[PDB]
Design an enzyme around this catalytic site. Structure first.
Site, PDB file in Angstrom:
ATOM      1  N   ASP A   1      -3.331   3.372  -3.717  1.00 56.50           N
ATOM      2  CA  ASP A   1      -4.154   2.296  -4.246  1.00 56.50           C
ATOM      3  C   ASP A   1      -4.861   1.037  -2.630  1.00 56.50           C
ATOM      4  OD1 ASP A   1      -1.473   1.842  -2.765  1.00 56.50           O
ATOM      5  OD2 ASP A   1      -0.992   0.756  -4.058  1.00 56.50           O
TER       6      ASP A   1
ATOM      7  N   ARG B   1       6.229 -13.712  -9.587  1.00 57.48           N
ATOM      8  CA  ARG B   1       5.628 -13.017  -8.504  1.00 57.48           C
ATOM      9  C   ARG B   1       4.229 -14.011  -8.307  1.00 57.48           C
ATOM     10  NH1 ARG B   1       5.092  -8.618  -3.972  1.00 57.48           N
ATOM     11  NH2 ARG B   1       4.145  -7.260  -5.271  1.00 57.48           N
TER      12      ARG B   1
ATOM     13  N   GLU C   1       6.788 -10.207   5.183  1.00 59.46           N
ATOM     14  CA  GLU C   1       6.045  -8.878   4.862  1.00 59.46           C
ATOM     15  C   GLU C   1       4.766  -9.394   6.435  1.00 59.46           C
ATOM     16  OE1 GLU C   1       5.146  -8.182   0.708  1.00 59.46           O
ATOM     17  OE2 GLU C   1       3.812 -10.036   0.338  1.00 59.46           O
TER      18      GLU C   1
HETATM   19 PB   LIG Z   1       2.062  -8.221  -0.717  1.00 58.27          PB
END
Ligand SMILES: [Pb+2]
Ligand SMILES: [Cl-]
Ligand SMILES: [Cl-]
Ligand SMILES: [Cl-]
Ligand SMILES: [Cl-]
Ligand SMILES: [Cl-]
Ligand SMILES: [Cl-]
Ligand SMILES: [Cl-]
Ligand SMILES: [Cl-]
Ligand SMILES: [Cl-]
Ligand SMILES: [Cl-]
Ligand SMILES: [Cl-]
Ligand SMILES: [Cl-]
Ligand SMILES: [Cl-]
Ligand SMILES: [Cl-]
Ligand SMILES: [Cl-]
Ligand SMILES: [Cl-]
Ligand SMILES: [K+]
Ligand SMILES: [K+]
Ligand SMILES: [K+]
Ligand SMILES: [K+]
Ligand SMILES: [K+]
Ligand SMILES: [K+]
Ligand SMILES: [K+]
Ligand SMILES: [K+]
Ligand SMILES: [K+]
Ligand SMILES: [K+]
Ligand SMILES: [K+]
Ligand SMILES: [K+]
Ligand SMILES: [K+]
Ligand SMILES: [K+]
Ligand SMILES: [K+]
Ligand code: NA
Ligand code: NA
Ligand code: NA
Ligand code: NA
Ligand code: NA
Ligand SMILES: [Pb+2]
Ligand SMILES: [Pb+2]
Ligand SMILES: [Pb+2]
Ligand SMILES: [Pb+2]
Ligand SMILES: [Pb+2]
Ligand SMILES: [Pb+2]
Ligand SMILES: [Pb+2]
Ligand SMILES: [Pb+2]
Ligand SMILES: [Pb+2]
Ligand SMILES: [Pb+2]
Ligand SMILES: [Pb+2]
Ligand SMILES: [Pb+2]
Ligand SMILES: [Pb+2]
Ligand SMILES: [Pb+2]
Ligand SMILES: [Pb+2]
Ligand SMILES: [Pb+2]
Ligand SMILES: [Pb+2]
Ligand SMILES: [Pb+2]
Ligand SMILES: [Pb+2]
Lengths: 356, 356, 356, 356, 356
Positions: B312, B78, B152
């Protein structure tokens, strides 16, 4: 656009059972009252064995010619079709042409045809063009045969989104569209879905989307087959869920389902307020209450049996999903053969690879 | 279009941890059997700190060169990408070009790349064009690098609808598309959604839509990260729910998840019928059973901490939603400052306004 | 594109009640603090009787002129509109033109207008063009009036999918779009849905789709009216469900709803851990706990009453669904008249056919 | 959208001639007054040998840095690009990135870039994306670099039709478009056209279409190179014909053409009414008055020569048309070999087949 | 779609001349036989001064009410409209609404309206929507008012390409389209074209394209004004050229043109074979044979005059092209001021800059 503003029941009958192959049609054609469907669908596709489909189309012409005038609902036979098979398309078209020969006396009692397995909007246009050609080949009024489709692919679900605008193009006659019917059985396989029991997913989005497609385009939405015929309560609950999506019709597979589906969307006879052994071999209430999750061995047993006998074809296809998956894994993951044999024993593994 | 007809597991590894920064990759590369993913994704985007991403891309070339031949699954690293950042796009493209330099020996073991944060279909084409340029810059076969995307954004979800027809245009090579992977974490933020605990919504429609997009376009659907690693039961239930949508693959974050996800869609070893103290400091069963809904004070505490340390980045962004909302309200509703101070005390209010 | 990045509350007020017809507006205009909406919508469409709508538009100008400067939120009156009524469109446009006459002093306190009953994207453009003409007729800045729409048709739901690209065309000013608001009441009727109690379906996909449309296009998503005003718990649960879809605003029908909706998306004041007679005529807790499923007789009673009085218009329309269905059945299934009369008695049947 | 509402002259200069390779640029940069172009195009594509193009891009930065501030017109260098060559696209983009490095002092005097050989609208978007990335890589204002294209394919001609609507999509920055310039030389080859002399067809429809594309989209139309530099009368007549199509700019290849083209669209100094040996070796008026139609032998001579020397590349390509055609005929029509050999003699035939 | 399958003549009349302002209409309305147009267009746009257009619309109602029944052709008045002026659109719509008030007796003799200056297809839809609203405001049959457009922009020319498919969408009534009429005068300015004399370019592609648009969409193509009324031969030759493109109608500006245009497309009375002083002050044959090319000084003279008098507006606009160009050059090329002053003298230059 069409005479029936609502359709409650969509009832399929096999066209040629392999005696009088047409027996199922002649009886369905006699149904009356609450037992008779708003839409009756002599079914020359999945309800009829493929070796029987040419006699099926003959039987459709014989019966509708003989009994079609008296049928109280509308008649829309289902033809064969597939988005990915030009031979199947041409077959369906040939059958439609035969069935509507005005000299045979059936067409005048046929309101339209049901086309299954449609794809993207350009595939719908190919069916439409066949309709238009049949109409002109036999002097019928243009647009007089309604087209209904079964939505049983991702492609077709997406195609409903663009229908209003595609329908108005002058190169087609898609104003003939009438029903949009979900086909959960095949849609499940097109989506490659699977459940532990083999029960169909509920696919609430599909039904939402088909309801919406119908209201956007002036069509009528209908849900697919509920094949657990004994589960009368489940059938009612599905119909109620559907009615809450604006899908007010449903497929019926028996005349009792037809009665249930004809009655469900009508208002109750009386009001109701809601708030926040015992018999003997009638313990088949337990068959109703149970379900079975098969093992790899079971599924492979079953398939081997069905393949030798060649569970209907759709059950076989549903099983093919996890098995196709098992076989993709086996072909591509040699590093996993040991854990797999240990998981199922090698008897099964090598058998699972022969299946398909 | 691609060798793997099904993909069960999609397992990400950080590429440079700030010792041997590449340690996580070298171990992931040794995984075998049920612990090894159908698809392994050396992850140069969210799994790797941004200051580390250039060393990450170096580590990808080192490890795959050294260990890539023996890896039993397919390798799809990725890269960084963003629909709204031209600099990020160009970065990802530069890394892809380096990684595939045939003189470095990694490319021959790389099946394709994963592109996150994609937008509308025209953004997908920009990634495709980079693929095509990389292929031609290094003499690879055109189309040999598969592209996979992470869905997303709302934009990307809508883009799946038009893919079949856009894919066939001659100005692109988007037949290279392989996986469509949901990214619930970032999708949640793109949608500006929020939950009391911070748990991700389930987003059943997204998953339905991605499953459908995949079957309409000849791609493979995969669900996103299930980051509560201890909740093995929850992971299984999500996988089962997914399988009922025809989403048969899922993201895995540990090798135990990989085992679980590799096993879940395979048929069980035996059949089953369904029907209608105790230890000690093992009462961490209660950590499993509880969840905490934070207050404004907590969230602002937390953010102040995280900002100073700069939970995070994704946790921080999730918190930013209700806080951004609180701050929009405060800036635009002076008439509400009194009820707000009274609600939280002024300590908190003015602190909530400094956060962000 | 717009000043308010989030909108929590969208509160409608009738514009002319048939005393001071403008009384409801003058009070709503005095609301402040948590009781005052992020967006206040003087409502000249469904909240106001149709014979009163011309006085309604006068009242909007009187009140906003007099009290508009001090209003702490943004003001966006709702005009009449319908995708299928050119007369309604023209009416809304005429009212908008009057309301924004700069010599009357209201326009300078009006941020935009809400347009209901919109259809496909070409209908949205017709509303936009009216906005543009109003702006130019009165020297307002182009694009200064925000447009918000109510999504209450299948058509409009599908239209959100193509918005990003249609918005950029140079023949429109649709960058003025601000809110996308669900209208579950009318959407239910457009979809021809029905429930046993008459409660609205939850339509989770619609809300998902509107949330997604909003994030794809730079708009803000808002849910529709929750008209069971006493069910404060239900209202909260809907808001929480919505927030999990990224729909962070909701319609409010009273100032108490406004307080509840203004407070719901803000973080709680303190943390919480989650884990796996009594009064007297306060037993109206039972009214809260009950619901009634009407019979055919009830519905026909009710309709006959409402028609003679001519239950608001929307209740009447909701009933019209099952009754329209009953009447389609009766007109087309003579073979069913006997089972129907027996089902309801002929008193009712023939009465059900007179209704409508 | 751009500062120059009209552009009269578009003048190209080679960037590296194989002495001071940059000599042509430094002189062009000194042009002033009527001899200086509204738009000057340092030309790194067809005007510059391919082995010289990397030094060309260096020379562009050196000269514009040194002399760019004083240049009275706008500077838009032409980069390499091709719709069918990903390597060429990437090359052009790399050069653009170098040229605009703000530390080298050229970019601040560069208004934009010219992109040749563009295809369908999706290819234009790929160039746009490179512009956007260059801007962000060097901190330039987004959209500050104008893009101009050369229309030299059927594909690009058709693409102008859909520009207004594609330009407004939010996934691109194509509002940067400035000039639409015809490239008759390459367009002729893309169209596979041919003339007896090798003179370019006039392509009046192309010019009409480019003029129309420009007015529909807010761009400026410019005609292509008129390479018969001595034919000052012909140049004037082309410019007049162009002006009658609303194509008011033209490409200029010398400073004298620049003067002529700068003067042509300006109104005459005085009015005029229209109505229904001699020297010596100045009989080169006859070179002006003649043209030569070559034979097969000539063309094959010429090509053999040019191939050994490897007539510029474009002349060679123009010849390749009839020769490619001759060779397609020879490969596919064995039945015609005898009439062909007899037509040209076998010397030529077999030579014509070796050419290419 | 419309009663007249062919239209030969399209004759415009001013609606209010600044005596009886309606005098021109009352006479045009009396024309009969060959002197009367297939289509008569009372012209409230370019034929009528703008300060007179509200009296113009009154005059249209007075005359058509009084004389409309007896008119032998069809009546289609031209309203004001502009793709870039919302105020003009709204004006045209207001006039259309007044003119069609059924209580005034004109509408029943009006077949439709002509809309000039239309743009892309979305602008055509805005006009259509106004038609639909007018029809519904006055109880006319939906679609009973034909719409005709004048094609006088690049945008509109391109829009004809997509008409067949846009016309069928259900959100419009564009099946009302009847004539597609070229407007060479304004199209010339939209294209920014120019000729030495000021004569209109012939624009053969436009006419081809409009003819083609008409046959593709079921409309009728008509050419624009031939304003050199004395040039009867030229008018005939244009009509013949048009007929060879399938544009069989033409605009007529006098009743003699009407006779000529009514006669031209009819077959001749007899056959013909084709093969490969004198008076006195009738030497105005020389005015016919001459044309004048103006200088900068002339054009600036003329404009200064016309601006002070404020050559019709269209002549002024045509001149504005080269002058706008001269002024763009002067503003942007300080390096050219010396050659320009020397070219025209400074008297003229500075005057040319004051013009506009
Ligand atoms: Pb992302
Ligand atoms: Cl096929
Ligand atoms: Cl398909
Ligand atoms: Cl429906
Ligand atoms: Cl961007
Ligand atoms: Cl995007
Ligand atoms: Cl899949
Ligand atoms: Cl309408
Ligand atoms: Cl609509
Ligand atoms: Cl959807
Ligand atoms: Cl939102
Ligand atoms: Cl390419
Ligand atoms: Cl191309
Ligand atoms: Cl231009
Ligand atoms: Cl406008
Ligand atoms: Cl336009
Ligand atoms: Cl025509
Ligand atoms: K059609
Ligand atoms: K048709
Ligand atoms: K529906
Ligand atoms: K492709
Ligand atoms: K390609
Ligand atoms: K799937
Ligand atoms: K726009
Ligand atoms: K605009
Ligand atoms: K949202
Ligand atoms: K853009
Ligand atoms: K952009
Ligand atoms: K060609
Ligand atoms: K032009
Ligand atoms: K239409
Ligand atoms: K219509
Ligand atoms: Na019937
Ligand atoms: Na493998
Ligand atoms: Na405020
Ligand atoms: Na300058
Ligand atoms: Na007549
Ligand atoms: Pb397919
Ligand atoms: Pb099927
Ligand atoms: Pb609808
Ligand atoms: Pb067994
Ligand atoms: Pb974005
Ligand atoms: Pb499929
Ligand atoms: Pb604290
Ligand atoms: Pb409608
Ligand atoms: Pb409504
Ligand atoms: Pb977004
Ligand atoms: Pb009663
Ligand atoms: Pb090409
Ligand atoms: Pb070129
Ligand atoms: Pb224009
Ligand atoms: Pb020779
Ligand atoms: Pb325009
Ligand atoms: Pb005009
Ligand atoms: Pb035709
Ligand atoms: Pb003078």
């Amino acid at each position: 656009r069409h005479d029936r503003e609502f359709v409650r029941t969509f009832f399929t009958s096999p066209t040629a059972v392999e005696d009088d192959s047409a027996k199922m049609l002649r009886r369905a054609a006699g149904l009356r009252g609450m037992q008779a469907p708003d839409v009756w669908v002599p079914d020359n596709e999945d309800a009829t064995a493929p070796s029987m489909r040419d006699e099926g189309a003959e039987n459709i012409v014989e019966v509708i010619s003989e009994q079609g005038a008296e049928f109280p609902g509308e008649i829309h036979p289902r033809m064969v079709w597939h988005r990915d098979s030009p031979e199947t398309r041409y077959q369906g078209f040939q059958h439609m042409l035969d069935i509507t020969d005005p000299e045979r006396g059936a067409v005048e009692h046929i309101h339209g045809f049901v086309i299954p397995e449609v794809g993207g909007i350009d595939d719908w246009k190919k069916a439409d063009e066949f309709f238009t050609i049949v109409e002109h080949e036999h002097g019928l009024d243009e647009g007089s045969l309604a087209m209904s489709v079964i939505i049983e692919s991702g492609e077709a679900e997406l195609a409903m989104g663009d229908l209003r605008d595609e329908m108005g193009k002058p190169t087609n006659n898609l104003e003939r569209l009438f029903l949009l019917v979900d086909g959960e059985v095949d849609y499940t396989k097109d989506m490659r879905a699977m459940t532990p029991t083999g029960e169909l997913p509920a696919w609430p989005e599909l039904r939402h989307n088909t309801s919406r497609g119908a209201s956007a385009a002036g069509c009528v939405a209908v849900d697919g087959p509920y094949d657990d015929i004994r589960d009368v309560e489940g059938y009612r609950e599905r119909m109620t869920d559907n009615q809450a999506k604006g899908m007010l019709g449903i497929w019926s597979l028996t005349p009792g389902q037809v009665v249930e589906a004809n009655t469900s969307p009508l208002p109750p006879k009386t009001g109701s307020w809601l708030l926040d052994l015992t018999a003997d071999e009638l313990r088949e209430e337990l068959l109703g209450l149970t379900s079975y999750v098969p093992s790899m061995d079971d599924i492979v047993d079953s398939m081997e049996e069905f393949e030798a006998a060649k569970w209907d074809e759709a059950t076989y296809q549903a099983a093919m999903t996890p098995i196709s998956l098992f076989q993709d894994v086996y072909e591509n993951r040699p590093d996993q053969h040991e854990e797999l044999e240990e998981r199922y024993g090698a008897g099964v593994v090598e058998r699972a690879m022969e299946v398909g």
